[PDB]
Amino acid sequence: VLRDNIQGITKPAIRRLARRGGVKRISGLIYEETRGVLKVFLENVIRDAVTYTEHAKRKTVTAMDVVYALKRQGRTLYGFGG
Amino acid sequence: LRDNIQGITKPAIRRLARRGGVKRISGLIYEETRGVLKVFLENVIRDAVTYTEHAKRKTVTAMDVVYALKRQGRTLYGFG
Amino acid sequence: HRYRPGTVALREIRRYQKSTELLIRKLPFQRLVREIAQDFKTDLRFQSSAVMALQEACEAYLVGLFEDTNLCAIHAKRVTIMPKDIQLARRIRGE
Amino acid sequence: HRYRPGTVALREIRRYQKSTELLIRKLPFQRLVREIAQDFKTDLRFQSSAVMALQEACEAYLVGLFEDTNLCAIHAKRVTIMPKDIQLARRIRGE
Amino acid sequence: ALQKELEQFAKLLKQKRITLGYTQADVGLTLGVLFGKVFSQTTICRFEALQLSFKNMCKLRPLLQKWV
Amino acid sequence: VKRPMNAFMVWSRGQRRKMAQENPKMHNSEISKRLGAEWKLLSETEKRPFIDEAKRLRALHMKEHPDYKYRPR
Amino acid sequence: SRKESYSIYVYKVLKQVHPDTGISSKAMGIMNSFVNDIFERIAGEASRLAHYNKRSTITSREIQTAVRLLLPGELAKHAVSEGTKAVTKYTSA
Amino acid sequence: RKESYSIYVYKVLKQVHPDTGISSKAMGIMNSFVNDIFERIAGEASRLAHYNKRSTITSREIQTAVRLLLPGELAKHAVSEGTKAVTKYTSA
Amino acid sequence: GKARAKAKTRSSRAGLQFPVGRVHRLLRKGNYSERVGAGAPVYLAAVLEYLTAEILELAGNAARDNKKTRIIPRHLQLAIRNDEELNKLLGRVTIAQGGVLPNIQAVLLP
Amino acid sequence: GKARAKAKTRSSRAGLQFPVGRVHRLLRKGNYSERVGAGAPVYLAAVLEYLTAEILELAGNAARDNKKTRIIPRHLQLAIRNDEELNKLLGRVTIAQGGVLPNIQAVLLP
DNA sequence: CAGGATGTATTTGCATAACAAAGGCCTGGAGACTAGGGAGTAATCCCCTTGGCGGTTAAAACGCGGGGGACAGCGCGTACGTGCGTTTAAGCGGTGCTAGAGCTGTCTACGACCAATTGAGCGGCCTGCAG
DNA sequence: CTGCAGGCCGCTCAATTGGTCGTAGACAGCTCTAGCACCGCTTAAACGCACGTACGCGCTGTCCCCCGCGTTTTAACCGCCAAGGGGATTACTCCCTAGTCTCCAGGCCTTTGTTATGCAAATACATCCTG
Predict the structure, then answer these.
(1) Which residues in window 53-72 of I are less than 7 A from strand K by Cβ?
(2) Which CATH entry fits the domain spanning F1-73: 1.10.30.10, 3.90.1140.10, 1.20.120.910, 1.10.10.10?
(3) Which residues does this entry mark as bearing N6-lactoyllysine (chains I, J)?
(4) CA D18 – CA D20 distance, rounded (Å)
(5) CA–C1' G2–L89 (A)
């Protein structure tokens, strides 16, 4: 059983992403808001990948199932599949 | 004909803005809004025409407008 | 004995959020559609319902943009809408 | 000789934009994926490549969001990012 | 002028090696024996192929001329 | 222009025919496996003429094609 | 000479909930566009599921999965409950 | 395994930049690319055939699909090459 | 849960009002698949009917909110928004003469 | 194109490098249509090949900007963005290890 | 100037390819061949689309003054950034176990297909009433 | 009062029924991949602290651009008509593409032993932010 791995995303990890996006100054409240958003984005993707996996009556989620999960979101992951 | 972009009157622009919750409109908005509307029309019309041409016909149907909108990530109900 | 500025504008927001009627005049709209159409082909025709179908989409589009535009102005701590507020909303939308 | 505030920030913006690798730690991310997955079903597994695919999607997502967020703050005439700047971008995006 | 001198020798070295039935590895190892400084067959290959820098070819050439 | 045979290849050529022909209906896949092992079990003297023949073929090949180089795609 | 509508079925569904409530022809037009939109999407995803599993047939199972992928939350759930029932029942005596 | 275009992508690159190589990951990116575009065009072409009540997709449906999917001039060059390739193919 | 599985009309046998037999036909067409199962159109018809009912139920309530005994395109629009899940499903749909919600922001008030 | 009618393969007949015969085959699958024409895969293969070339050309240039002799996912990513048209077609595509453009707004600078 | 700290260009070894030789096997592609249903052509009729006409009158254009809000500038407080030293667990490599993915072959309940049978729904018209 | 609604007739063709046929998917059974759990060790990244000031926030005052009416001008809308161009339907005809079968060309496997070939490490200049 896993718990609270949302805190496994360190402040630096968030900061670095924000920096890549052009962010220079970050409010201490951002870290929590960012986490809420990440979690939802990630959760929706996983759920669809799991749903596809379940339909196929399999146990292991494949990278291709993640790709399908993204495809429907209007996104693609090149280099991982079709 | 030409110059139909002026056919979208200030009140027409304003009323739309009001429906969207806008109280105060800068005088610069009217022109910016038109630029945006025009682009929307160009993309939708062009595709509707493209579908019409593919069908080897001359009249654009409501359904051709629907398909043009469909590819913009939108649907329109009540027209087919 | 004028209603103070902002009174009518607020009321009009309320009213336009109640009506379903088209706000853009029909003939002017139709003509705009045609002149645009001529950039692709002349002597083209449209069903009368096609023009209305297009207008419904156009108004819905602009209103949705205005709502996001309004939020941008609110974020700027103000009421008045500037071209920038439109551009910011569009950029974020990926237009 | 301490570099004044903002010198590093610009270097870090520059550097991460230039780089191509991941910014989020792998094991922490992998666990986050699973913690969430456990709420859909027990005894689920992932290919190592599936976890990588998820992380790649997540970082790309957050970076794009931060960029839009940054623009919102700029529009608001600020450099520091507030939670609201994120929310505005998401709202406009329909998220 | 240096490029040509090095090109000419590299061609001669390859021909000499082949004629005498030696490998590139043999040249590398033998230079070790002769001068105390061991070279890999990669270096020898790159020498014959002129894929090395001028200074590296210049430092190595004398040893290879002697090897022949 | 092809590549000259190495020590193993010169030898395996002789044993290719000495296995393929003497032991009929055997796949080349199987022959190669066996020959690989058989070569490894040979003494230096047994390998020698093939090792030197490979040298001879390489020298001869280059003599016939002075500018020949190995370039795989 | 005309494409079939669902206006007869939509009308009937309305009255089972609000038997004293009428509906305009335009509203029916909206509902007909609606039914075709949902149908198309589910059938579309069902096609993908069959494709992903290298199949040629769509069954009740693909429809079920497709519903979950397309519909959110509780609506997806009830749609699944009713669909599952209708089929479980369909093949029953 | 699955069909890929790694051999074709490799060749196309060298017709443009004969001295430039490409990583296996980049090839993976290009394989995703070809499959994506293929699906989209075939998908739209399917709609065109469906909409006009047909059972066959021909070069014309592809042409229309290309115009709808590709922007600007990029679309034109694709159309020109497509039109030509068909012309050449049958003109033999 | 009916005891009547004898009905010839597939929609009736399925306990549905929607034309199951047609749904079968529609799935068959459109090249969604090469083969269509027996339970496929049944499952789908139930789904389509369920969602249809939910919109109409909520729209009927919208009509009442406006003090009416009829559903018009507007009442359908209000219904879609009132239900958050329904809103998402149809959140990108433009409704002919649907209008918008009466959303007034506090910052715009006196 | 070629000045000859002679061909060895379908692709060589078209004058294309892409596997035209396969494209035809792929179009028969995915249930896009019940029937596929002969000119369809020829037209399509040319399109796929053309677009492929454009990305690769620009990526080769991106590789040059970095003084490299090799295309990597990053170079493909940069190529896509620099070309406005490709930046729409693939505008929303995530490239594994593609990175982002080095864009810093003036308001963030001294 | 005058020093400290970071970033490119330019050289080196470590895996790991591609070729040689032989010939049986795989399978994908190209080349014919016929069958018959899809798409193309021409002819026919009738809808709706365009265009013009004149009159009414709601909406738009323009002027004007008032004042509410955008804007710039000022000053104060703090939460954000910047190092520094200490602590954490992420990452690496290697070991060992087996659960589940993937492939093969059997065979059988399912769906496509056809021809015969049947009545729920289509179209138009009658007729009067609710929003 | 327009447009909604149920009732009526008479089809009429889409739906239902009941059989044959072949095969896509269910099912069991075997192989062995890669996913999981675990341990130890190194060390880059993370945690927490103290200190300083650049940025965010709120307040004040200036003035200028937008709002709210009143009056005058515009063309949008309404109802009406006539002309004819294009869309829909129909029958008839050809010929393109699925479906089947035949046969060939190339690539694959398979082993050691050269010649490269493509990079992660090392090392020497440039470049930059304070004195």
Answers:
(1) 68-70
(2) 1.10.30.10
(3) 2
(4) 7
(5) 13
